[PDB]
């Protein structure tokens, strides 16, 4: 998660993370490709019946 | 807020994951102990 990992539970930080902004999205986009892959990746194995 | 989470107005079919179930605060509060050890200023406010 973007938030609660750098400053959970203050919201004082968190309008200080809209300053950099579209950092974190880029990050979540990134393992959410990886996830989706292991689900691919089994499938290609035992899935040939 | 899936809607927001994408910054669009459409989305197409599938699953998608957006902000956390977290409780804002309600309130704020304070503690420190004191129970013993008063300062003996009695003696002085108390002599003739």
Same mark, same amino acid.
């Given at each position: 998660?973007? +938030?609660?990992?750098?400053?959970?539970?203050?919201?004082?930080?968190? *309008? !200080? !993370?809209? %300053?950099?902004?579209?950092?974190?999205? %880029?990050?979540?986009?990134?393992? +959410?490709?990886?996830?989706?892959?292991?689900?691919?990746?089994?499938?290609?194995?035992?899935?040939?019946? | 807020?899936?809607?927001?989470?994408?910054?669009?107005?459409?989305?197409?079919?599938?699953?998608?994951? +957006?902000? *956390?179930?977290?409780?804002?605060?309600?309130?704020?509060?304070?503690?420190?102990? *004191?129970?013993? *050890?008063?300062?003996?200023?009695?003696?002085?406010?108390?002599?003739?």
């Amino acid at each position: 998660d973007c +938030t609660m990992y750098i400053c959970g539970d203050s919201t004082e930080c968190s *309008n !200080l !993370l809209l %300053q950099y902004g579209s950092f974190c999205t %880029q990050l979540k986009r990134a393992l +959410t490709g990886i996830a989706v892959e292991q689900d691919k990746n089994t499938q290609e194995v035992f899935a040939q019946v | 807020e899936t809607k927001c989470t994408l910054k669009s107005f459409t989305v197409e079919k599938g699953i998608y994951q +957006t902000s *956390n179930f977290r409780v804002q605060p309600t309130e704020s509060i304070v503690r420190f102990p *004191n129970i013993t *050890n008063l300062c003996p200023f009695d003696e002085v406010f108390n002599a003739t």
